[PDB]
Design a protein around this motif. Structure first.
Motif, short mmCIF file in Angstrom:
data_model
loop_
_atom_site.label_atom_id
_atom_site.label_comp_id
_atom_site.label_asym_id
_atom_site.label_seq_id
_atom_site.Cartn_x
_atom_site.Cartn_y
_atom_site.Cartn_z
N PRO A 1 29.08 1.85 70.44
CA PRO A 1 30.15 2.68 69.86
C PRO A 1 29.81 3.31 68.53
O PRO A 1 30.50 4.25 68.13
CB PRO A 1 31.32 1.69 69.72
N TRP A 2 28.78 2.84 67.82
CA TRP A 2 28.47 3.38 66.51
C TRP A 2 27.84 4.76 66.63
O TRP A 2 26.96 4.98 67.46
CB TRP A 2 27.52 2.43 65.77
N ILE B 1 28.34 7.88 59.06
CA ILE B 1 28.32 6.89 60.14
C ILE B 1 29.76 6.56 60.50
O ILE B 1 30.53 6.10 59.65
CB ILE B 1 27.53 5.62 59.78
N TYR B 2 30.11 6.80 61.75
CA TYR B 2 31.44 6.53 62.28
C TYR B 2 31.38 5.38 63.27
O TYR B 2 30.33 5.05 63.83
CB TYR B 2 32.01 7.76 62.99
N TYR B 3 32.54 4.76 63.48
CA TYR B 3 32.75 3.88 64.62
C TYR B 3 33.54 4.66 65.66
O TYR B 3 34.67 5.08 65.41
CB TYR B 3 33.49 2.61 64.21
N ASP B 4 32.94 4.84 66.84
CA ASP B 4 33.53 5.66 67.89
C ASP B 4 33.75 4.83 69.14
O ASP B 4 32.81 4.64 69.94
CB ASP B 4 32.64 6.86 68.20
N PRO B 5 34.96 4.31 69.37
CA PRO B 5 35.18 3.49 70.57
C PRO B 5 35.20 4.29 71.86
O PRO B 5 34.62 3.86 72.86
CB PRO B 5 36.54 2.82 70.29
N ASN C 1 37.76 5.60 59.38
CA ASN C 1 36.78 5.25 60.39
C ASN C 1 35.34 5.42 59.90
O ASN C 1 34.40 5.11 60.64
CB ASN C 1 37.03 6.09 61.65
N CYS C 2 35.14 5.89 58.68
CA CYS C 2 33.81 6.02 58.10
C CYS C 2 33.41 4.72 57.42
O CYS C 2 34.26 4.02 56.85
CB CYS C 2 33.76 7.16 57.08
N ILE C 3 32.13 4.38 57.49
CA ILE C 3 31.60 3.25 56.74
C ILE C 3 30.51 3.65 55.76
O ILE C 3 30.26 2.90 54.80
CB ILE C 3 31.09 2.14 57.68
N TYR C 4 29.84 4.79 55.95
CA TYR C 4 28.85 5.27 54.99
C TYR C 4 28.74 6.77 55.12
O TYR C 4 28.29 7.27 56.16
CB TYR C 4 27.48 4.62 55.22
N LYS D 1 38.42 -4.21 70.67
CA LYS D 1 37.50 -3.10 70.40
C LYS D 1 37.98 -2.29 69.18
O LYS D 1 38.34 -1.11 69.26
CB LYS D 1 37.31 -2.23 71.66
#
Ligand SMILES: [Zn+2]
Ligand SMILES: [Zn+2]
Lengths: 49, 146, 116, 98, 145, 194, 49
Positions: free
Chosen positions: D68-69, D34-38, C42-45, C24
């Motif tokens: 998670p996004w 836009i973050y990835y949040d597990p 942790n940012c993508i845009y 994960k």
């Protein structure tokens, strides 16, 4: 009298430019800061003429 | 060192002297004459030097006994000679064309252009031979006055 | 915070975000290649609508050698205390709605850029 | 033209102006990300951590089933004040638009 | 998204396929050719959709086949179109920088400069050009005419 | 390329971000890392007519880190006097030399070749500062409009044309009246040729 | 308008909003116009034609 009035109007528009550069010119509602500044300058010069 | 500094009334006199010098040298129609001289010399030389050479090959496909190696020719243009504006009459006698003579007789104030031609004759199995056709007349170009 | 883009170390292509569920974790992976790496941030845009330009960084410090630019001798340099400075308005798209001056120190060794 | 208390009071006329002018999400927000949040209850943004556990203490959906996004939209306060908007209206508009 | 309009081609071509057609298969080399400073965030945000669109084309001859399939009077069996694509990329794209062979590097530099100027004007960091600004005008006198 | 310039084909693409691009007739040739000293050297070379002729326009885009050199035909230029360190390069000695070209030989080409008059075209005017008069140069720095002047107008009345410069006092008239007189000066009557 | 880069004419300074560079003519027709304001009046009079 005419030359003194023209010189006073030029000093007024220099002071308007200075207060706009010193972030002291509140824009009127309905228009932006450039439009407010140009309206004030045009009003000063047309009133002088 | 301050004696060389130009004073005020000396500045109006000096600047109009400078403008007088500029108009005494260049004149009023200098761009036309300069563009024409540039055109004649460099443009005509660059056109006749940058043009591709004529490449030739005979094709006698409609007759019997066709040679497998037809003769070939090549033509090259390399040099330009421009003469004075000259008029040839009906009998063919050249004469110097005056601008007033061109205006009064409804003639064209033009100068003939001559080109050097190199003609190379090449045969497969034989040494090619060069032929020089110098001062070949190709046409008259008009000449801007002055 | 703002994140940049990353390139593959095997074919120098565009690295795209990807997710694995066994651990994960977000991974910056390669689509034309087989390379993958851990993402530090942790940012993508990140998109900013009114975006705070550090236009003091964007103005070139070579503009002190400009004869067409104004000069002033009252606003001292905050870094090297040089009296002479060059002031001009911004060149961007949001900053012509501000009437804001921008000052560059004229000292060739300092070249401090600030705003009063 | 206006009738009643909107005709003489600038506040109700400003309310009419807000009801007439097109206000999208362009005119009102500060920035998007836009973050990835597990872990939603252990999100990467610490400043969110004070209140996100408030929302997931009595949630209307399973936090395991969610993706998670994350899309974080920070709003400008002055544009919220000028348009006289509130966050429950934005949440209701999102819930009826999506 | 960024496209390129070519001479003698009535279709619209993305610039990334054009850059791969000049002999640059990697993306880092092309972004070196366009974005001179890698520290700039917003231009890296602006170059993303062209990279996302031209993901299928990854090889030079595939890019030349992409170019040649859209030209007027298209050829057959790929390679002649590829040859036709070279005739667009050597004699038609930017003859002022060079029409000889092995000039793809300077042409790629100039194309990257054009994309750099377009992205500078998109972000407002430079002013737009003026048509009636007389510095952008020349006078045909008797000479060139 | 012999002075200090690095060509495009001999550099890495990651070394361009600090340097200044050079365009010659719209062709990018390379980069240079000291553009002010190179621009001063190029101005010195043009003002002496050593290698670069006086026709060639040279632009240093400072904020965009560019140098553009234009040599093609069609560009339109105006002669301007040279001002450095707040003083004209034209002295009283040159005025006496023009009085003796009114005697013999110190023509305008010698004046341009001496390095006191440059042909500034309409694209170089965005990067230079032109004084209206030498009266503007002598102002005290307490009330000075500018202290870094690079050029000076010879006379402002040279901004007019041929038919518009026959008007006595055109600065006291309305501008459409000047346009009407420039239209009607071609329709006047007189000895058109000798 | 700023036909040049932030200048109406090359004799002024960049980002000058004062009345001389803007185009205000402080002289009458009897006194005669300065060359910058003469050119500004030429641009003003072209618009009517
Ligand atoms: Zn890879
Ligand atoms: Zn300093």
């Amino acid at each position: 009298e005419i030359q003194q009035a023209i010189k006073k109007a030029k000093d007024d528009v220099i002071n308007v430019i200075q207060k706009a550069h010193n972030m002291e010119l509140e824009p009127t509602p309905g228009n932006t800061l450039r439009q407010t500044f140009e309206n004030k300058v045009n009003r000063i010069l047309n009133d002088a003429r | 060192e301050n004696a060389e500094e130009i004073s005020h009334e000396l500045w109006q006199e000096a600047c109009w002297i400078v403008i007088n010098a500029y108009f005494d040298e260049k004149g009023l129609v200098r761009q036309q004459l300069d563009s024409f001289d540039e055109f004649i010399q460099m443009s005509v030389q660059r056109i006749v030097e940058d043009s591709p050479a004529i490449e030739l090959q005979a094709e006698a496909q409609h007759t019997s006994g066709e040679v497998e190696t037809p003769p070939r020719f090549s033509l090259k243009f390399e040099q330009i000679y421009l003469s004075k504006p000259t008029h040839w009459e009906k009998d063919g006698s050249p004469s110097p064309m005056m601008p007033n003579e061109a205006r009064l007789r409804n003639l064209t104030y033009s100068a003939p252009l001559y080109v050097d031609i190199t003609k190379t004759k090449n045969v497969e199995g034989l040494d090619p031979v060069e032929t020089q056709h110098q001062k070949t007349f190709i046409g008259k170009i008009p000449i801007m006055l002055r | 915070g703002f994140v940049g883009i990353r390139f593959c170390q095997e074919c120098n292509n565009m690295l795209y975000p990807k997710e694995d569920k066994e651990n994960k974790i977000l991974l910056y992976a390669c689509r034309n290649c087989d390379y993958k790496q851990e993402a530090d941030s942790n940012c993508i845009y990140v998109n900013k609508i009114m975006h705070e330009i550090d236009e003091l960084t964007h103005i070139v410090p070579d503009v002190i050698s400009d004869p067409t630019l104004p000069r002033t001798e009252d606003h001292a340099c905050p870094k090297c205390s040089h009296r002479e400075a060059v002031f001009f308005q911004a060149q961007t798209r949001r900053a012509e709605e501000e009437m804001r001056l921008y000052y560059v120190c004229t000292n060739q060794n300092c070249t401090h850029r600030w705003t009063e | 033209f206006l009738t009643g208390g909107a005709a003489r009071d600038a506040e109700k006329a400003k309310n009419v102006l807000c009801r007439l002018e097109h206000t999208t999400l362009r005119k009102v927000t500060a920035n998007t990300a836009i973050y990835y949040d597990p872990d939603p209850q252990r999100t990467v943004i610490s400043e969110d951590q004070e209140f996100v556990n408030v929302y997931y203490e009595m949630p209307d959906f399973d936090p395991t089933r969610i993706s998670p996004w994350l899309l974080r939209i920070e709003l400008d306060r002055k544009r919220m004040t000028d348009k006289k908007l509130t966050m429950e209206q934005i949440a209701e508009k999102i819930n009826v638009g999506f | 998204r960024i496209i390129a309009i070519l001479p003698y081609i009535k279709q619209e071509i993305p610039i990334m396929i054009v850059f791969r057609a000049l002999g640059f298969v990697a993306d880092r080399d092309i972004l070196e050719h366009i974005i001179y400073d890698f520290d700039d965030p917003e231009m890296m945000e602006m170059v993303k959709p062209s990279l996302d669109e031209a993901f299928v084309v990854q090889e030079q001859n595939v890019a030349l086949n992409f170019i040649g399939a859209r030209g007027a009077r298209p050829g057959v069996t790929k390679d002649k179109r590829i040859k036709y694509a070279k005739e667009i990329l050597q004699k038609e794209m930017l003859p002022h920088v060079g029409v000889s062979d092995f000039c793809e590097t300077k042409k790629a530099y100039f194309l990257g400069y054009m994309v750099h100027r377009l992205l500078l004007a998109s972000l407002g960091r430079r002013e737009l050009d003026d048509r009636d600004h007389y510095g952008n005008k020349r006078l045909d006198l008797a000479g060139p005419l | 390329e012999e002075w200090s310039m690095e060509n495009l084909e001999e550099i890495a693409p990651s070394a361009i971000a600090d340097a200044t691009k050079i365009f010659v007739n719209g062709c990018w040739v390379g980069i240079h890392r000291d553009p002010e000293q190179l621009m001063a050297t190029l101005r010195k070379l043009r003002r002496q007519m050593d290698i670069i002729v006086s026709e060639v326009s040279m632009i240093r885009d400072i904020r965009d880190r560019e140098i553009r050199i234009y040599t093609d035909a069609g560009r339109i230029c105006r002669p301007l006097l040279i001002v450095e360190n707040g003083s004209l390069l034209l002295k009283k000695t040159h005025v006496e030399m023009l009085k003796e070209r009114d005697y013999n030989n110190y023509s305008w080409q010698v004046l341009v070749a001496s390095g006191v008059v440059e042909y500034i075209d309409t694209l170089e005017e965005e990067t230079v500062m032109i004084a209206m008069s030498p009266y503007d140069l002598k102002q005290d720095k307490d009330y000075a409009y500018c202290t870094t002047y690079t050029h000076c107008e010879i006379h402002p009345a040279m901004i007019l044309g041929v038919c518009a410069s026959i008007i006595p006092f055109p600065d006291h008239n309305q501008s459409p009246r000047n346009t009407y007189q420039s239209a009607m000066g071609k329709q006047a009557m007189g000895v058109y040729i000798t | 308008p700023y036909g040049f880069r932030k200048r109406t004419l090359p004799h002024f300074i960049k980002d000058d909003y004062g009345p001389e560079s803007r185009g205000f003519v402080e002289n009458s027709y009897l006194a005669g116009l300065t060359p910058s304001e003469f050119y500004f009046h030429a641009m003003g009079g072209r618009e009517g034609l």
